[PDB]
Design a protein around this ligand. Structure first.
Ligand SMILES: Nc1ncnc2c1ncn2[C@@H]1O[C@H](COP(=O)(O)OP(=O)(O)O)[C@@H](O)[C@H]1O
Ligand SMILES: Nc1ncnc2c1ncn2[C@@H]1O[C@H](COP(=O)(O)OP(=O)(O)O)[C@@H](O)[C@H]1O
Ligand SMILES: Nc1ncnc2c1ncn2[C@@H]1O[C@H](COP(=O)(O)OP(=O)(O)O)[C@@H](O)[C@H]1O
Ligand SMILES: C[S@](=O)(CC[C@H](N)C(=O)O)=NP(=O)(O)O
Ligand SMILES: C[S@](=O)(CC[C@H](N)C(=O)O)=NP(=O)(O)O
Ligand SMILES: C[S@](=O)(CC[C@H](N)C(=O)O)=NP(=O)(O)O
Ligand SMILES: C[S@](=O)(CC[C@H](N)C(=O)O)=NP(=O)(O)O
Ligand SMILES: [Cl-]
Ligand SMILES: [Cl-]
Ligand SMILES: [Cl-]
Ligand SMILES: [Cl-]
Ligand SMILES: [Mg+2]
Ligand SMILES: [Mg+2]
Ligand SMILES: [Mg+2]
Ligand SMILES: [Mg+2]
Ligand SMILES: [Mg+2]
Ligand SMILES: [Mg+2]
Ligand SMILES: [Mg+2]
Ligand SMILES: [Mg+2]
Ligand SMILES: [Mg+2]
Ligand SMILES: [Mg+2]
Lengths: 475, 475, 243, 475
């Protein structure tokens, strides 16, 4: 796509407004709107200014001014706004030198793709991401000196089977979803068919190649919609747009969506499994008919890299305090650093695909959607490429239900990290694999560590947990 | 039809989505949705994957991946979804060997039909099933440390005659249905005429050949809709689709349906009577002018098999704890293992159909809708064939009201099983007739027994019943 | 007899002290799901001429042959004996693992997971006795106490040897070991059927008569077992509404 | 006191009941009641039996029976029960050997005192403990699949200045306590003067030698009542009786008390500072006019032991998840491991006492009362004694506000542990100083570690925090 392709699209669509978008460091898209009449060549030539102070992980107040330059390949019409709007993603640049910004997530993805080519290992990294989510009806929460609470609610939640009426006073008609029982009964047990169809249609209309949509395991409206894999930067751009469409399709239809890893205690969390393959000259590299699970040496060393760097890598792939509430046994999320074919209890699963080399890939099951896909996908690639470069051999595959291992035997396998502060500490101590080729820089890494400690870890740590009152009020 | 016929139907209808459906072991249909764009030759050639470990009766987590292959004969347009959708049922297959799955209910029905042909006895088994249901307004329930309740409700329920207002605050207008008095006065006493017309219409539009529709005996909106019999596998697919259309027609019209065997205490339960006949070379085998109730030796021995194998057979035909609350006297459901013409108190009724050989069949009144029609129909056939093959003679017919015979006479007649655990116990100890020709396998039967004990029998067993507090609080 | 009279007086006093003070008491075996039930453990000893018969320093748990054979009788007749000691439908909600009530038919010292526990009492013969942990107070103390005695007396008369004591947490045994031990009965209808088929040890000396045993069976079937069997359980709605 | 002295007390007081008491492992006192008629010489000779499997940290179900033998020194008349009652503490014993139980906390304290004598260092360790607490009006909390909350409330809590009425509907009259402003304004700002007087009186009548009573720093009714120090075991029995008297005086007067370390977020937590001193032959050992803060080598090496062993010692002195919410800066609790005279921000303060050698002691400010005082005082002693035996020199005192230290200076001092899992891990790795002389045994330490992991650390870790919803719902 060219600047001229974008102007033509805006004209043909009778666009009233253009929405200017970019990513903050933690992973939330940011925006301002310009009139169509202000969308000209100058936007591409000179760019547009914003306040870098007000964006998390960006600039200080005395060095606030920053610049944005358009990415023509990201232009998509908005499905929700009454006034016809075209959305476009931008790269962040220095306002003096016009150089790409070191803490622009989209720049990191850019640099990662270029570094890959520079290695001669491959020219394309493909990412297929499964971002699960919950379709709720309501959420409320607070934090005070003498009390704190949260509650999420959903009509299909099993906690409501005993309700006398629904929230709007209408009768309880049953057909609510049992815990761990949402994957995937037909309607009327599935109460979200029509809404997911709206989501599917909005995605098709915005340029997604769709594969499938379904209710997920969790009670209270867990869902998943799958779309075709793409190369790293494109994939991460797709992910951000996907979350926007899912959240706003829900919002326009009276619902509220969360992508948080573990909103429900005692039911499945929400992961972001990443299917990954490396290709060169249009041909796949992950396949060897003689390998365990049909994997080549290249594929096996990529896995070796992921599982070796995991203790620090999870700082980018599982970046929140809530992340580590999902990494607990019995819910199809990982609890140790094992790879295994067909195995949804493992950290890396190899899906059963047959002899087709183009279908061969690994599934990294650890990641969730609580962070930044540009950083997550890039960190995973840097880990895998360190594995290949150093020929890191992964530990032998364990083809077992990993949650049913007796404690003496469970202890003999490297475990997933317990909490966020551990992965941040470990990232601080060893991150050289990430700074290879300048893909990540020290200033980015130091900012990330500093933001997570001051804004997430410490605020949670200092606040009494409601279960501490259950355990200790009467001590 | 054929694959190409399905592609033409999808094209002619301008289908937006395709719903991929299969059956879990207990008997609930499962689904996910693909776009019309993703419905191609590839789906037929190499199939679609899913999580076998999330499906009841299927796989463990470390062997989770399973495969689905389409059945063209089952393609139907969905009458409920705003986005035009084509529903198709699939067979479950191993993802390595591509062979049919030993615990796919639809495969069991396949195997049953092919076993029949191999015996030489017949080439076609016809099943006409009468699946009764209740049209309720609401339901709620729960189970706690210190309490437990359930309540179902319906405008037409006799328990509501003294209500000052209806649920929405409108006036009580009377015309409610007396207990055991629903079969079948005209409107306004019949409050569901228009709704049952919609159900009939939706079924007609889904390729059903309809016979009749009516209010049934039970107060609170019991109902029955009858459609033309078909061969075993088609009949079981028809049953599953009929449940879907009934439940969702009701849901779209502000109501809620249950197929559970005994939702009301002191009024009729809901059965699934199965009219059964064997045919060979296009000619019926059940008729003989000289026999009792016009039955041939073949038909009599089939009945012999049903009544002889009933103590283990009811594990598939009456597969839930709630099943055995229906098998009590006074409600046109069986209490002992007897056959009789014209007799609605019997286990096997022979309906009065005259001299036409084509109309001659047996009605097995024992079964209910609480399980798996694929497994239940197959098991009934396997029992009947062991009866023919071994010439099992049924005990003398008893042409009396079976609920009202003297206690001394009732003692010579074998009674129906008292509870689920007894039929599961009996199935474990003696299931050879089911494993004939490999139709049922030991892994299926072991899985069934295991599931019922762990997820149904024990869970009910450990929970105090409300009537225990009526009997024992003051001991 | 004095003990059974004491029990009925105890229950009357507990119930009405509660009632006069704004409360309400229940002696039912399992009013709460997921928490401990209410048992009626019966510590039992036989005496002659003011001197105890249960003690022998050389026996397992300091028990005499007479005591060991009494235990033998209790564990052997239990499939029918429970018709009088655990006489209600609710009784059998208590007989589940994890709550210090028995689930299999063994004896063991110091063991609160066993059917019969021998409490640690030392060398005093006046203190040596068995604790039958199976019984609850949902029935009749006069009939429960008498039936336990008749079972123990048959054990002594026929020198019934109990199976070897299992000094382990009986809820936590591996499958192969757990299945080799006779289990407690699952439900009331099972013990009533068994009482009907085999009650000779109770009608010895005419202590229990056929008319009492027939009335008991007829009462439990008509007024308890069948009324509960025919009524849908709330949890059937949790499991089956959407079938 | 002898057996006969207690029998005489029970007689003279015309006692109706005797309450048999002992300590569980975590720190809660247990009890059952016997009639005065059953309190006889057999109780002293034979003891009394209980179920060791229902007490936490004690026996398994198959080895349940345990024995109790009385301690005549601990006999006091109960101030609350209408039926005149004498309370007596017991020691736990093996029912076969009659030996003391290895996991009886009261036995541990007894072993500690005997070990002290055997060293020659001293013959008496005196403990003066300051157990702060909150006098609340109410508390509620829960933990569900879809939500979790807690709330404490008190009339004097600053969060209530804006209330239209009080809980009972009467007018808001002001004079509520500002956060951090409760130490210690006159009434009516102090709303608990009369209640604290009732507490003081009850304590006086139970044989406590009282020093003072006051409102503490926290809003919402924080309080402290100080009594005369005593030798290790006596001091620990005193602490347990003190907690019982405080809680039940509040209860009988319409209130509810908590000793939990940090019930309020952003106000002072509740500590249990322990003033400590060693004496030999009736003479003090802590004093030397020439030492810093008038401390002797014995005293300095005792402090050196406490600060060196703290990383594992806090497993007994700060034994809960909630403990580590208190160990944050700005609330007069320690954040690092230094000693300093006059310094309420330090880990060990030396109170200003002057020239009197009997008044000379250390204050260990780290501990709270969320656990077991028998274990905590014993663990403190063993750390101190290891310090004296090995002449461990503490790092130079830092006589500054330790919360306000410059980044370089702060980082040069060892911080207190962040969380319970860290101190439990460290106790497991290094606990030889505790097992000296068999005072603590391996079985005790192993059981403690096991209890805390399975019943406290893990249960909190798996439950989502409400603030995670504040941070992450919209990711
Ligand atoms: N060779 C490949 N490399 C990377 N991703 C792939 C490849 N083949 C397929 N994918 C992607 O993997 C994802 C699989 O998602 P899904 O079907 O939900 O898998 P799962 O079996 O884990 O549920 C899809 O996004 C798909 O486009
Ligand atoms: N020869 C036959 N073999 C099997 N099923 C048959 C045969 N003839 C009719 N049926 C089916 O039996 C069912 C009868 O249902 P229904 O009219 O409700 O009977 P009932 O008299 O038991 O109420 C229908 O589904 C019908 O198509
Ligand atoms: N020599 C000593 N050794 C141990 N404890 C002592 C000694 N002298 C006094 N104490 C005790 O120390 C405690 C001091 O408590 P408090 O007056 O609240 O002190 P502060 O608030 O200044 O820390 C009292 O219990 C007191 O009896
Ligand atoms: C059914 S599941 O295994 C569930 C994944 C889980 N929600 C997780 O937290 O990773 N997902 P998929 O089959 O789509 O890979
Ligand atoms: C009127 S009935 O006998 C009622 C049967 C009852 N509902 C049962 O089988 O539980 N049905 P049908 O006449 O359709 O055979
Ligand atoms: C503490 S317990 O073991 C509990 C017994 C349980 N309530 C039961 O159902 O038997 N009772 P006891 O120690 O009084 O014999
Ligand atoms: C006023 S304070 O310093 C407050 C101590 C604080 N509550 C703590 O958590 O240690 N106590 P004290 O003066 O009684 O030693
Ligand atoms: Cl953390
Ligand atoms: Cl059952
Ligand atoms: Cl029963
Ligand atoms: Cl912790
Ligand atoms: Mg998926
Ligand atoms: Mg998924
Ligand atoms: Mg996946
Ligand atoms: Mg019919
Ligand atoms: Mg009918
Ligand atoms: Mg019929
Ligand atoms: Mg007892
Ligand atoms: Mg003080
Ligand atoms: Mg204080
Ligand atoms: Mg102090």
């Amino acid at each position: 796509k060219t600047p001229d392709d974008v102007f033509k699209l805006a004209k043909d669509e009778k666009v009233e407004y253009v929405d200017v978008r970019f990513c903050d460091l933690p992973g939330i898209m940011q925006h301002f709107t310009i009139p169509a009449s202000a969308f000209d060549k100058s936007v591409f030539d000179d760019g547009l200014a914003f306040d870098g102070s007000s964006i998390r992980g960006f600039q200080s107040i005395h060095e606030s001014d920053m610049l944005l330059l358009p990415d023509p390949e990201t232009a998509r019409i908005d499905p929700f706004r009454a006034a016809k709007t075209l959305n476009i993603n931008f790269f962040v640049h220095d306002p003096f030198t016009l150089e790409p910004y070191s803490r622009d997530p989209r720049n990191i993805a850019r640099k990662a793709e270029n570094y890959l080519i520079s290695t001669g290992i491959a020219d394309t990294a493909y990412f297929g991401a499964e971002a699960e989510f919950y379709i709720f009806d309501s959420v409320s929460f607070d934090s005070r000196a003498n009390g704190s609470f949260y509650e999420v609610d959903a009509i299909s939640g099993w906690w409501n089977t005993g309700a006398a009426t629904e929230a709007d006073g209408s009768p309880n008609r049953g057909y609510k979803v049992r815990h761990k029982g949402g994957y995937f009964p037909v309607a009327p047990n599935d109460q979200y068919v029509d809404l997911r169809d709206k989501m599917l249609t909005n995605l098709i209309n915005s340029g997604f190649i769709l594969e499938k949509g379904h209710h997920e395991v969790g009670s209270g409206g867990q869902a998943e919609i799958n779309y075709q894999f793409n190369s790293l930067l494109h994939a991460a751009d797709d992910m951000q747009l996907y979350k926007y469409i899912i959240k706003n399709t829900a919002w326009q239809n009276g619902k509220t969506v969360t992508f948080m890893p573990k909103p429900l205690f005692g039911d499945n969390g929400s992961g972001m499994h990443c299917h990954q393959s490396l290709w060169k000259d249009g041909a796949p590299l992950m396949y060897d008919e003689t390998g365990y699970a049909g994997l080549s040496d290249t594929a096996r060393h990529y896995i070796g890299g992921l599982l070796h760097h995991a203790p620090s890598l999870l700082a980018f792939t599982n970046p929140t305090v809530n992340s580590y509430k999902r990494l607990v046994p019995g819910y199809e999320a990982p609890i140790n650093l094992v790879y295994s074919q067909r195995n949804r209890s493992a950290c890396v699963r190899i899906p059963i695909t047959g002899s087709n080399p183009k279908a061969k890939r690994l599934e990294f099951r650890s990641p969730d959607s609580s962070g930044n896909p540009y950083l997550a996908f890039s960190a995973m690639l840097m880990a895998g490429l360190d594995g290949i470069k150093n020929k890191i051999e992964p530990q032998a595959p364990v083809d077992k239900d990993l949650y049913e291992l007796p404690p003496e035997e469970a202890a003999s396998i490297p475990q997933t990290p317990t909490q966020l502060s551990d992965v941040i500490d470990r990232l601080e101590a060893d991150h050289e694999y990430l700074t290879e080729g300048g893909v990540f820089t020290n200033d980015l890494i130091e900012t990330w560590i500093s933001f997570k400690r001051e804004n997430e870890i410490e605020p949670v740590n200092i606040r009494p947990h409601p279960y501490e009152f259950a355990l200790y009020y009467d001590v």
